[PDB]
Amino acid sequence: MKYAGILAGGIGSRMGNVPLPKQFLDLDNKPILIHTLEKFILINDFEKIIIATPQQWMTHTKDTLRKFKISDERIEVIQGGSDRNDTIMNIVKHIESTNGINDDDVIVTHDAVRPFLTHRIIKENIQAALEYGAVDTVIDAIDTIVTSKDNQTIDAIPVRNEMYQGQTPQSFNINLLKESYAQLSDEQKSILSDACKIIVETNKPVRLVKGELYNIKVTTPYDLKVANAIIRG
Amino acid sequence: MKYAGILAGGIGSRMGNVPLPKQFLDLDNKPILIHTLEKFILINDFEKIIIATPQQWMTHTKDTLRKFKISDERIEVIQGGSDRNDTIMNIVKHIESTNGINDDDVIVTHDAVRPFLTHRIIKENIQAALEYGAVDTVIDAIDTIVTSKDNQTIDAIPVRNEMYQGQTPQSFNINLLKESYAQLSDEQKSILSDACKIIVETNKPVRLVKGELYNIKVTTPYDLKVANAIIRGGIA
Numbered sequence: 001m002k003y004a005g006i007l008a009g010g011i012g013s014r015m016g017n018v019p020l021p022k023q024f025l026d027l028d029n030k031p032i033l034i035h036t037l038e039k040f041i042l043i044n045d046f047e048k049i050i051i052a053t054p055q056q057w058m059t060h061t062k063d064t065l066r067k068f069k070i071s072d073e074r075i076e077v078i079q080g081g082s083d084r085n086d087t088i089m090n091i092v093k094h095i096e097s098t099n100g101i102n103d104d105d106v107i108v109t110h111d112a113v114r115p116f117l118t119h120r121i122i123k124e125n126i127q128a129a130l131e132y133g134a135v136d137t138v139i140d141a142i143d144t145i146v147t148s149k150d151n152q153t154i155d156a157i158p159v160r161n162e163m164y165q166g167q168t169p170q171s172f173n174i175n176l177l178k179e180s181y182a183q184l185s186d187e188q189k190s191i192l193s194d195a196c197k198i199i200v201e202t203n204k205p206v207r208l209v210k211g212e213l214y215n216i217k218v219t220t221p222y223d224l225k226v227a228n229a230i231i232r233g
Numbered sequence: 234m235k236y237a238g239i240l241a242g243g244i245g246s247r248m249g250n251v252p253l254p255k256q257f258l259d260l261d262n263k264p265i266l267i268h269t270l271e272k273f274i275l276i277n278d279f280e281k282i283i284i285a286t287p288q289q290w291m292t293h294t295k296d297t298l299r300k301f302k303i304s305d306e307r308i309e310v311i312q313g314g315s316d317r318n319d320t321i322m323n324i325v326k327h328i329e330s331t332n333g334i335n336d337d338d339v340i341v342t343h344d345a346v347r348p349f350l351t352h353r354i355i356k357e358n359i360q361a362a363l364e365y366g367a368v369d370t371v372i373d374a375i376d377t378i379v380t381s382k383d384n385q386t387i388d389a390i391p392v393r394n395e396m397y398q399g400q401t402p403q404s405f406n407i408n409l410l411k412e413s414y415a416q417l418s419d420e421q422k423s424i425l426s427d428a429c430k431i432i433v434e435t436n437k438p439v440r441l442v443k444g445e446l447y448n449i450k451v452t453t454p455y456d457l458k459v460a461n462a463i464i465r466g467g468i469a
């Protein structure tokens with residue numbers, strides 16, 4: 001079975017790491033979250049489309065689904081976790097308690113504020129997860145990537161041809177993801193913020209699926225202004 | 234003395250069509266290169282502002298400057314090189330053969346196809362080059378960065394808080410740039426995608442100056458749609 005996990009944990013402020021509900025901001029007279037969900041409802045192969053969000057946003061999420069006539073029976077809103085990977089695991093646990101996890105199940109996890117992913121991206125994610133167990137959506141780096149350990153000076157400049165900008169979806173065989181996450185120590189769980197890095201850190205391969213330049217994360221006022229252009233055109 | 238080097242030397246190859254150089258494409262009825270140049274003209278302290286273009290585009294560039302009533306005597310259009318760092322060094326050599334290089338000279342090198350840099354970015358680049366000798370214009374990485382050695386599977390996912398997207402300008406003390414570049418082999422030069430790595434590879438510091446989310450590089454039709462939005466929105 002194939003599941004979608006829509007991660008609506010918000011976008012943390014720079015000071016304080018306060019979750020801001022950017023997925024509710026308006027994009028051409030409809031919340032960003034609704035645009036993203038519409039893309040997933042178009043995929044008939046999903047058994048459930050699970051939105052995980054902080055307890056304090058669950059009612060507004062349900063109210064917004066109702067206002068924008070999103071009635072698809074596969075949509076469910078559940079409470080998120082203490083960080084992004086813990087929220088993913090809340091989704092996995094919800095699947096297990098509801099249907100039970102099958103050996104061939106896959107989960108397609110995706111940012112609520114990435115409304116411009118495509119049918120191809122979703123299908124390629126599903127197929128790569130079924131065959132290989134773990135997948136990241138990426139695009140080739142356009143800028144030269146540089147590192148710094150002090151926010152003052154360059155530490156290194158890697159070869160750009162080996163660098164990729166990570167997007168989402170990130171998709172996994174569910175049992176593989178669960179087994180890998182179970183291998184991490186409490187310290188690792190506190191430090192890891194990315195879902196594909198769970199797999200990498202536990203020495204299993206992660207496949208690349210190529211995204212799109214326009215599959216942006218709408219997290220700043222600048223990105224919201226750009227998003228209006230992408231949508232209208 | 235302070236010099237600007239506007240890098241307009243690439244050629245936009247297209248499959249099955251006449252090459253259309255991205256730096257000359259119209260953006261709100263004005264070529265991208267002119268948008269970029271206007272920012273540099275507003276900096277009084279440049280001694281010269283040198284635009285490098287492919288040989289066959291030099292006359293067209295000079296004429297287009299005249300078309301937009303741009304007569305600034307500091308502007309010179311010269312021939313670029315076969316790769317980006319060769320274009321930068323063509324500009325350095327032109328300065329050397331024209332004025333000679335002073336020990337305190339700095340050069341602000343910048344993509345012609347990045348029209349949305351700001352007064353602040355240029356001024357911080359100049360000051361950074363004067364104080365530290367080498368500087369990169371960067372922003373915090375917008376995405377998690379992923380690496381791959383086989384172009385099929387992830388090799389590593391570095392700690393995201395140490396990752397930055399390189400933009401331009403990149404600015405240098407001229408003698409430092411020249412001396413560092415002279416140390417590199419042809420293979421080392423082949424691997425470079427920017428100028429600041431010349432400095433990093435020769436074990437001299439490169440300082441960071443913050444760019445902007447809208448200091449985008451215009452190279453594909455998608456980027457031009459974004460550029461048009463930026464202009465109409467007053468974002469930059």
Ligand SMILES: Nc1ccn([C@@H]2O[C@H](COP(=O)(O)OP(=O)(O)OC[C@@H](O)[C@@H](O)[C@@H](O)CO)[C@@H](O)[C@H]2O)c(=O)n1
Binds near residue numbers: 240242243317347
């Ligand atoms: N023979 C050449 C080739 C290119 N050029 C100029 O170079 C500009 C960017 O060129 P291009 O769009 O192809 O981008 P690159 O792949 O070179 O990488 C750049 C990336 O490193 C940098 O922006 C940033 O990230 C660093 O921090 C364009 O104006 C070209 O005309 C030149 O004058 N002569």
